[PDB]
C-alpha cells in the first residue's frame, strides 16, 4: 500500500483584496478615491490516505457558518462571505471518497481561523494537532464570548462538546514526524498566533509543502514578499515566508498556498483523482 | 454512491504496422522493397467501480506470457512482443486501487485474444461475459492443442482449471444492460469471431464507448475506414465500425479505441485518478 | 482612606507533602515513614478603597464538595474543603454590606480551585489574571479534565456568566490599580502565572499578599522549602526571592497563602478591619 493525496474543494470566499495583499492599490493624487476589489478565492483541504493512517490537513468552514442563524457573526459574514454548494461541504467530499470521519487518525489544524478549523468537531477519533499558542489564543476569545471575528464561538463550543483529542505543538517544537514522509512544520507566530504547515513526500510527485495562511498566494510569496492587510506578527510573517523558501529549496518541494485562485485551478481535485 | 471509472495501464506491445493498418505502405516501382515498421501501442483495461458492483472491461496479458518458459509461442513472442514492468500487471494495478480480484462482479471479455483475455483466470467469483462464437472458436483452438497464434493454449487451460462462471452473449442478443448506465454492445463477427463492446454513461463525463479491437485506432476509424491486416470477417468489421459511429452519434459518446497510442496518452490513468 | 478586611472562607486538609515537599523522608530506621493530613485556611481579602472596592482571591465555590459537587471525587478525597454557610464568600460579603456588583476589580492570584471558586459571582467587576494562567486553565477546560486543581464546572460558569477579563501580560509588572494598590507579577512558579498585591495602608503600612507563591512561613524560610508538585521550580524560588526583596525594600509584611498560625493572628472581617 502506498499513499494517495487528495485536494478537496470546499467552496469559495470573497473579501477585500487589501486583507490578502496589504496596500495593493494605494490612493494617489491622480486617483484619490481608489476603489478596492472584492476578490474570490478557494477554501480547500488535503487528505493524505497514508498506509499508517489517514491524515487531514485543515477542515474548511462549518456547514452552519452562514445565514441569519449561522455561527459566524453578521459583520464577519458581510466581509468574508463563504459560498459553497452541498457537494463542497467537507463531510460530503469525504463521503464521495468513501472515507469515514471515524477513520481519520490525525487532523492538522494549520491555525484556528474560521475557514480552516470549521469542521474539527467531526473528527472524534482523531488526534487534533495545533500550535499551543494558537489554541490558547482561540480559547481566550471563547472565554470572552467574542461573537465577531475570525475565531468562531460556536465552532469552539462544538470542539469542547465533542471532546476532541488535542495534541499541542510546543512553541519550540519543530519537524515533527507523524508517519513515513509526513512531517509537521512549525512556523510559529505570523499570520496568527501559531501556524503549522506540513511537508509531504510522495513516491512519484516528490515533496509538497502545505503552507496554509503562512503564504496566501504566489503574489504574497514573491519576491518581493507582500504581507497581508491584517497581520498579528509582521516580523514573524516575513521570517516564516523565508523559512518556507529555504525548506522548499533544500528539499526541492512545491509550495501549496492557502488561498491562491490560479494555483488551485491547476490542482487535480478529488472529483478527478489524487497524487501518488 | 457514484461510479468511478479507471483506465489501467498494462504495458506496451510492438508489431508490424501492417497488422494494424492493412497495406499501409505498398511497394511501388520506385520503392519495390518498401520496408515496414515495428509500431508500439498500449495494452489497457477499464475498471468501472459501480455502486451495483465492480465491472472490468478486458484483462490485458498474463504475467507468464513472455520468455523461454512463457505461455505465448516463440513465433508469437517474436511478432507481438509485450513489455510490462511488474507495476503494469493487472493484479498489481488492481491492488494499488485496493481492489481484490474476488471483488469483481462482471468481467467483459471483448474477445479472447492474448492481450485482452490474459488474466481472466484471476476472476473466479465474477460472471465472465463473452460472445458465444468467440468462446466456441477459442475452445476449438484449445482442443487442437494450437501452440502459436492469438489464442493462448495455456491461458485457456487456466480458465478451465479455475472453473470460471461464463455467460455467453448469443449472436442475436444486443444492448444488454448490466447495471445503471452500463450496457453491453454486441458487434458480432469482424476482427474476431465475436466482439463485445461497452457503453458507459457517467454522470459528469457522459457517454463512453469501449470499442476494443473493433477499432484499433483513430487511423482505423477514419474516415476513410482502414481495416487491419488479418481480419476474420472483413464485411462484419466494416459493419461494426459503422455501428459504432452510429451509436456514438446518437448517444453523443466518445469512442475509446483498442490500441491508440495518442488517445491513450490523453487518458487520465489509475495512477492519477478516475472519471466520474 | 481604605479599609482592609480578611474573610475566613473555611478550611482544607491535604497531605503535608503537597505543602512541604519531602517533609519527612523515609530512612533505614523508619522505612515506611507516615505522612500527615494537615489543615489550613482558605481566605480572601477585601480592600474597601475610595477609587473602588478590590477583592483579592475568591475561595472555593459553595457547590464544590459532595456527590453532586463540581470537584472530582479523587480531588475531594485528597483536598477536602470544610466550610459552614457563614464561611461562603457571598455570605462574608453580605455581612460587610458589600454588594458583589460593587466590586470593581477582582484579583485572581491564580486559577486553582481554592482561589478562583467564586469568580462567577462578579459579573460587574474586571477580573484580573495572569495571561498564561488563563491560557492554561482554559486548555484544561477544552480537554474536559474533570479531576485536578482546575475545576471544569467553575470555568464553565465563568464563561456562561460572561465575565470581564483583563489579562496581565507575561512581561507586565508593578501595575497600579489605585493609590497604594499595586499588582505584583510573580510569573511562573507554583502555577503558570502568579499574581500578588502590594497594599499600602495609612496606619498599618505595607502588606504583600503572596497567595500560593508562598504557602507558609515554613515555605518562606530560610531555608526556602518548595511545595510538592510544582509547575516551575526555578520560577518558584525566584518568586520567593523577589517577595523577600520587595518586603525588605518597602518594609512590608508578607501574608502567606495558607499559613494556619499567621491566619489565626489576623483580625477577621467579623471583628473589624485594617487601616
Ligand atoms: Co487565516
Ligand atoms: Co484562510
Ligand atoms: Co484482438
Ligand atoms: Co488487441
Ligand atoms: Co494554588
Ligand atoms: Co491555594
Numbering used by the authors:
A (entry chain H), B (entry chain A): 8 to 283
C (entry chain L): 9 to 283
Reproduce text from the manuscript describing this model:
AaL (WP_021296945.1) is a lactonase isolated from the acidophilic, moderately thermostable bacterium Alicyclobacillus acidoterrestris. The crystal structure of AaL reveals a unique hydrophobic patch which could relate to its high specificity, and highlights a flexible active site loop which may be involved in substrate binding.
Similarly to what was observed in the AiiB structure, this density was attributed to a phosphate anion. In this structure, the α-metal is bridged with H118, H120, H198, D220 and two phosphate oxygen atoms, while the β-metal is bound to H123, H266, D122, D220 and two oxygen atoms from the phosphate anion. With the bound phosphate, the bridging water molecule is not present in the metal coordination. However, in the case of AaL, the corresponding residue, a leucine, does not interact with the bound anion.
